[PDB]
Design a protein around this nucleic acid. Structure first.
Ligand code: MG
Ligand code: MG
Ligand code: MG
Ligand code: MG
Ligand code: MG
Ligand code: MG
Ligand code: MG
Ligand code: MG
Ligand code: MG
Ligand code: MG
Ligand code: MG
Ligand code: MG
Ligand code: MG
Ligand code: ZN
Lengths: 153, 292, 148, 166, 308, 108
RNA sequence: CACCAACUUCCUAAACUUAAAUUGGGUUAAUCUAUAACUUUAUAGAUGCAACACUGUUAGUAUGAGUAACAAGAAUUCCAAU
């Protein structure tokens, strides 16, 4: 009975759900790497990317400026979003934020966690997953097949 | 009778091991330090000529025993079950290492050796099967190839698909049995005695002995089967999960003696392959690949 | 108590009656007190009955060990190794004499529910009944509806 | 109170003859008066049964239950007192032979209710016992094959006797 | 450790192999599909003629959605769009083994990925030489109308006019109350009804001291296989293999269905006029138009309807 | 509704020892290549992740000292430099955070 | 043209002929004392002298049940903090 309802139910209601995401987003737009429960971090991820879309539009656009105010509680971050975050992402058209699952919380609450960040941040690189090198047994065999097929092609 | 050949070789193998162990009296502790990235700085005191690299893994944890295939003793690859000789540095190599060159070769030789064992005992006692050698082929070759000479009476018969399927069942049976490889260093004089009947094996033994300053030779035993080993092999057969004898092709320049190249594929439990990927690699192996 | 207890089949020690009957009771030991009312009845048994019993059964070694004691005790040992002890506290000579005679006659076999009154190693002489008995054969052994 | 699992760690066996099989080691460790339910603790104890100690120290680490950390601590004390004070050559040559949780001494308190009424509350404790035996985990139970199932039926029929007769 | 491990296709593939593997599989699917593109030139089974009492095979289609449609009488008929996608006969059982009086054919559709299927399913499809299909279904087919396994099926199997029947799983609505599931009236909201508004009434009779089996009680609704009968075929789009079926068809949009010739008595012998085994475009007996319409249907681009 | 009879330990032992109520074993545990500590395949390694976060806190603390106020976030790009490193020409006009320690291996 | 069927009756060994308020009779478990016995016994003298049942009293532990119910606004540079 909640089929196609993209949104979650968080906070004390619809408005509260909007105000909790405004705080994670402002922390993200400020620190560029923020932690939260997997559910809430994933809920924001859509909102996080769309700010860059408005930032790309530019300062002059009235709609971008107005939106950047409701979604940035601290008012020292609107200049940053437009003048450093937006220039960085001009080349890209998507994939602004990187989300990964940090182990469960060691709090006695034991909630699922995730770390969300902005790509190209100055902070130390996250321990991302690494796929096996082409030299590994299985990988090397496939490469031999590719060479054979490329010759056949 | 072939059964007699296996017994005498087995007995010779046991005698060579017994003298080596008896040759070493008392226990002399030798210092070996862990040089790997994780768990660095650990130092094991081990028994000379008795302790094995597997024991070093046993102290650290069960993960090293399960996931370690080879060990780098002072920058050289050594079999996990091969006893240590002197103080050195030990580094364990898994399959998923960034530079698995040594691991791949060890697995490569290992699989083709199990292939040789299957062939000799697969034939009927009426016919005559002799093993010449297996050429060292890069893993990129797409399959491991063992050359086997056959009796003239079989020169007109080529195995069918059913015959190829039978070999894999025997190969899988060896894998299921989970027989550890036995690593032995043998002087040429003893090695010739164990394989005097096989002229090609004798010639191969001569080449190995000539290469080294001494007459030391490398002998590996898989249960009953005994054969010379080019390089360090996998500790156990169970390390293999997928196995397949792709096809066998007669060597065209075999006028004096007919030889058939037995080509197969295998993948370890670690690096398992999906069904569709397995088929494509299997098909490639059927193509005959020459030795460069 | 039948379902609550063990059971066995009728049995002997070493096929007692096939050859020569051998007395199963092996030893009786009785401890008595010189000055004790409870053992008074047993003291009479030793005075008169014990000598007669010893001669009557010459395969039963009898040990009498008067000691300062509170309860006279008789311990019976059989040839199969089974032991049995019965309290003789304040029993008259008549009771002991009857009690001892039961011990001599019994064997070491356990006193538990005996499943069957009878035992045979060759129950059948003419051949144990099997389904094919009393069944007539047919010419060429043709099973019903077989054309042949 | 009765602390017998502690004493069993002090049993001394007589020396072996030159050809006797090498006796596997046994270790006896436990923790008492744990603030946890014995019923809740059993699920953690039951899980690890019949496993190695580097295979039971991995499953525990990623469990959310509070007892998982408590058990893990007594599976590391056992893994240390075995190598130092019971002569176990290899840390990775052990397996959890037995593991169970027992009731502890509890405390009685008052849980209040809504009409001047109440009920008796018990603050629950428990103990947790583990034995480690040197040697790889015994191979798992192999299900009976169809042939084995059929054989038992025949064996059952073969035992049949003519009942209630000579 | 020395225990069972969990793995998937991507776990080991490297960066370069990842794209190559996802590309090699795509190449194979095209080649396999092309191999079966010519049924009649691949040792087809004998094509027996039609006689009374024959039953044909049916297709499995994907439910794209709905759209309006008008007839030359001016009335609007809501019609649904069903797309046939890679509909290939898979297996052919014989009469006796099938356990029915009639034989049975399996008709799969909607090719899917190969990386998340059990090894047994992949092996069966490899022997058949076709890419795996999302769903299997069984069609009761007379011996005369049998088609060789692996024969591709297309929307030309049907023609405008024929009444057809569609069956598929209904939309799953989850655990629901007695009111919504069975349309129970319920209890009034006011006048003193205390905590009883949507609850079931009296379960059963008191004396029997039990509840009759099959009683209507709260439970999961939907996600149950259901069939709709007597649905006319308004139009057939050959190019995109789209059949226009009157009214509503069970299931959600993009849900696979089982289209089949109607079993109603009036539609007993409507298969005679249509292709008896099936239509084979590779045969090229006749080149059909892209869009096939029914006589009553008012085609677009025609003059506006005038009720003279 | 109240129980009409006490439930026996045999019936209780049937309900609470059912397979549905037991802990299901985890098959996705592995060994981190770098540190060797245990991790789930679809999750990051806590030991390695803790190193990154600990460095992040130190860097963020240094940033806080420099700014010295709530609303002092600089629009210009941020950058972190360690001892022995000097800003490049391409790095001109970028805020610099100074750290006494040497450049960590993971940091590039 | 009969068989099966209940300690009715017979038979080997025995026994000596019919629900419960009430009524007569013979013994026995435990403990203390007298006098003894001395691994736990005897004849007498005694008595707080025997509990599967009173919504009995006290203590302990189950069942319902690991159930009903209980609690901390977010991020960070972080718990006498922004
Ligand atoms: Mg729903
Ligand atoms: Mg949803
Ligand atoms: Mg009050
Ligand atoms: Mg209670
Ligand atoms: Mg109403
Ligand atoms: Mg109401
Ligand atoms: Mg009578
Ligand atoms: Mg009283
Ligand atoms: Mg009582
Ligand atoms: Mg009472
Ligand atoms: Mg309880
Ligand atoms: Mg309940
Ligand atoms: Mg609740
Ligand atoms: Zn790590």
């Amino acid at each position: 009975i909640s089929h196609g309802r993209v949104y979650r139910r968080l906070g004390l209601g619809p408005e509260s759900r909007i105000h909790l995401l405004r705080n994670l987003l402002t922390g993200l737009v400020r620190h560029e790497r923020i932690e939260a429960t997997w559910a809430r971090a994933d809920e924001m991820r859509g909102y996080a990317e769309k700010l860059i879309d408005y930032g790309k539009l530019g300062d002059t656009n009235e709609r971008a400026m107005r939106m950047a105010d409701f979604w940035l509680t601290e008012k020292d971050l609107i200049p940053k979003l437009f003048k450093v975050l937006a220039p960085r992402f001009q080349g890209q058209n998507g994939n602004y934020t990187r989300m990964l699952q940090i182990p469960n919380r060691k709090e006695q609450d034991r909630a699922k966690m995730a770390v969300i960040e902005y790509k190209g941040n100055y902070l130390p690189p996250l321990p991302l997953p690494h796929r096996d090198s082409n030299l590994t047994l299985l990988n090397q065999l496939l490469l031999g097949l590719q060479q054979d097929l490329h010759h056949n092609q | 009778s072939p059964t007699e050949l296996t017994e005498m070789r087995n007995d010779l193998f046991n005698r060579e091991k017994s003298r080596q162990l008896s040759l070493t009296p008392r226990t002399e502790k030798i210092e070996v330090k862990h040089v790997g990235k994780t768990d660095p700085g650990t130092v094991f005191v081990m028994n000379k000529n008795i302790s094995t690299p597997y024991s070093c893994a046993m102290h650290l944890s069960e993960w090293y025993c399960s996931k370690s295939i080879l060990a780098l003793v002072d920058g050289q690859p050594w079999d996990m079950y091969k006893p240590l000789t002197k103080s050195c540095e030990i580094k364990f190599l898994t399959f998923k290492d960034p530079d698995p060159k040594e691991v791949n070769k060890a697995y490569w030789r290992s699989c083709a050796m199990m292939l040789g064992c299957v062939i000799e005992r697969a034939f009927k006692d009426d016919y005559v099967v002799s093993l010449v050698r297996a050429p060292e082929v890069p893993v990129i070759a797409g399959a491991f190839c063992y050359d086997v000479t056959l009796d003239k009476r079989l020169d007109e018969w080529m195995p069918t698909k059913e015959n190829l399927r039978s070999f894999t069942k025997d190969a899988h049976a060896l894998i299921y049995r989970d027989l550890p490889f036995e690593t032995l260093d043998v002087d040429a004089r003893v090695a010739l005695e164990i394989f005097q009947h096989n002229k090609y094996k004798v010639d191969f033994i001569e080449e190995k002995a000539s290469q080294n300053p001494e007459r030391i030779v490398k002998l590996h035993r898989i249960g009953d089967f005994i054969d010379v080993s080019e390089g360090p092999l996998i500790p156990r057969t169970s390390v293999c999960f997928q196995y397949e004898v792709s096809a066998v092709h007669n060597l065209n320049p075999s006028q004096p003696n007919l030889i058939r190249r037995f080509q197969g594929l295998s993948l370890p439990t670690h690096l398992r392959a999906q069904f569709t990927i397995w088929d494509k690699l299997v098909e490639r192996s059927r193509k005959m690949v020459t030795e460069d | 108590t039948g379902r609550g207890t063990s059971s066995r089949f009728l049995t002997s020690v070493l096929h007692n009656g096939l050859g020569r009957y051998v007395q199963q009771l092996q030893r009786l030991s009785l401890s008595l007190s010189r000055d004790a009312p409870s053992s008074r009845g047993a003291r009479e048994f030793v005075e008169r009955e014990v000598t007669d019993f010893a001669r009557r059964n010459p395969g039963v070694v009898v040990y009498v060990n008067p000691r300062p004691c509170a309860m006279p005790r008789i311990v019976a040992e059989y040839l199969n190794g089974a032991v049995r002890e019965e309290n003789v506290n304040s029993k008259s000579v008549e009771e002991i004499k009857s009690l001892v005679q039961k011990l001599a006659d019994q064997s070491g076999l356990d006193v538990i529910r005996i499943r069957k009154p009878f035992h045979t190693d060759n129950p059948s002489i003419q051949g144990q009944w099997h389904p094919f008995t009393n069944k007539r054969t047919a010419l060429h052994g043709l099973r019903p509806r077989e054309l042949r | 109170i009765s602390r017998k699992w502690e004493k069993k760690n002090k049993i001394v066996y007589p020396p072996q003859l030159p050809g006797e099989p090498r006796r596997p080691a046994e270790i006896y460790h436990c923790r008492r008066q744990i603030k946890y339910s014995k019923d809740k603790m059993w699920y953690l104890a039951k899980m690890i049964r019949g496993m190695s100690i580097d295979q039971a120290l991995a499953q525990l680490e990623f469990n959310d239950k509070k007892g998982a950390q408590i058990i893990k601590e007594v599976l590391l004390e056992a893994q240390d007192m075995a190598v130092r004070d019971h002569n176990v050559e290899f840390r990775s040559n052990l397996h959890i032979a037995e593991s169970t949780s027992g009731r502890g001494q509890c405390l009685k308190r008052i849980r209040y209710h809504g009409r001047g009424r109440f009920g008796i509350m018990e603050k629950v404790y428990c103990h947790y016992f583990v034995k480690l035996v040197e040697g790889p985990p015994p191979p798992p139970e192999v299900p009976k094959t169809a042939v084995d199932h059929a054989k038992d039926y025949i064996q059952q029929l073969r035992s049949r006797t003519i009942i209630h007769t000579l | 450790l020395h225990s069972k491990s969990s793995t998937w296709w991507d776990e080991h593939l490297s960066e370069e192999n990842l794209s190559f593997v996802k590309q090699l599989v795509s190449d194979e699917n095209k080649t396999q599909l092309t191999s079966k593109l010519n049924p009649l030139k691949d040792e087809p089974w004998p094509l027996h003629p039609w006689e009374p009492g024959s039953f044909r095979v049916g297709l499995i289609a994907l439910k794209l959605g709905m759209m309006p449609l008008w007839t030359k009488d001016g009335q609007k008929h809501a019609v649904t769009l069903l797309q046939v996608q890679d509909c290939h006969v898979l297996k052919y059982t014989p009469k006796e083994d099938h356990n029915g009086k009639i034989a049975a054919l399996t008709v799969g559709g909607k090719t899917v990925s190969r990386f998340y299927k059990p090894d047994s399913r992949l092996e069966f499809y490899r022997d058949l030489g076709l890419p795996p299909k999302q769903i299997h279904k069984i069609f009761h087919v007379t011996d005369n109308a049998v088609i060789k396994p692996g024969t591709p099926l297309y929307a030309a199997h049907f023609r405008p006019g024929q009444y057809v029947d569609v069956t598929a799983k209904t939309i799953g609505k989850g655990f629901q109350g007695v009111m919504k599931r069975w349309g129970f009236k319920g209890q009034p909201a006011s006048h003193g009804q205390t905590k009883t508004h949507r609850r079931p009434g009296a379960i059963s009779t008191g004396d029997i001291a039990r509840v009759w089996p099959g009683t209507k009680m709260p439970g999961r609704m939907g996600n149950q296989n259901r069939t709709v009968y007597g649905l006319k075929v308004w139009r057939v789009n050959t190019k995109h293999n789209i059949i226009y079926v009157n009214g509503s068809v069970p299931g959600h949009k993009n849900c696979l269905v089982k289209i089949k010739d109607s079993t109603l008595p009036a539609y007993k012998d409507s298969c005679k006029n249509l292709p008896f085994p099936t239509y084979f475009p590779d045969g090229d007996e006749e080149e059909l138009p892209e869009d096939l319409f029914d006589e009553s249907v008012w085609q677009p681009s025609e003059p506006s309807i005038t009720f003279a | 509704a109240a129980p009409k009879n006490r439930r026996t330990i045999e019936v209780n032992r049937c309900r609470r020892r059912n397979p549905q109520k037991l802990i299901k074993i985890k098959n996705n545990i592995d060994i981190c290549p770098e540190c060797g500590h245990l991790k789930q395949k679809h999750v990051l390694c806590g030991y390695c992740y803790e190193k990154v976060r600990q460095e992040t806190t130190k860097i963020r603390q240094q940033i806080g000292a420099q700014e010295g106020g709530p609303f002092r976030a600089p629009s210009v790009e941020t950058m972190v430099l360690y001892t022995g490193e000097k800003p490049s020409e391409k790095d001109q006009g970028k805020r610099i955070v100074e750290r006494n320690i040497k450049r960590p291996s993971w940091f590039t």
